[PDB]
From Swiss-Prot:
It comes from Homo sapiens (Human). This is Voltage-gated inwardly rectifying potassium channel KCNH2. Belongs to the potassium channel family. H (Eag) (TC 1.A.1.20) subfamily. Kv11.1/KCNH2 sub-subfamily. Phosphorylated on serine and threonine residues. Phosphorylation by PKA inhibits ion conduction. Changing A17V: Perturbs steady-state activation. Accelerates the activation rate at the most depolarised potentials. Affects modestly the activation rate at less positive voltages. The potassium channel is probably composed of a homo- or heterotetrameric complex of pore-forming alpha subunits that can associate with modulating beta subunits. Interacts with DNAJB12 and DNAJB14; chaperones DNAJB12 and DNAJB14 promote tetramerization. Heteromultimer with KCNH6/ERG2 and KCNH7/ERG3. Interacts with ALG10B. Forms a stable complex with KCNE1 or KCNE2, and that this heteromultimerization regulates inward rectifier potassium channel activity. Interacts with CANX. The core-glycosylated, but not the fully glycosylated form interacts with RNF207.
Length: 20
């Protein structure tokens, strides 16, 4: 994941494809 930004960013798209 990207370091400077996560929220509303990258963990969003992966999280919703992997977790949700």
């Amino acid at each position: 994941l990207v370091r400077v930004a996560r929220k509303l960013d990258r963990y969003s798209e992966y999280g919703a494809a992997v977790l949700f």
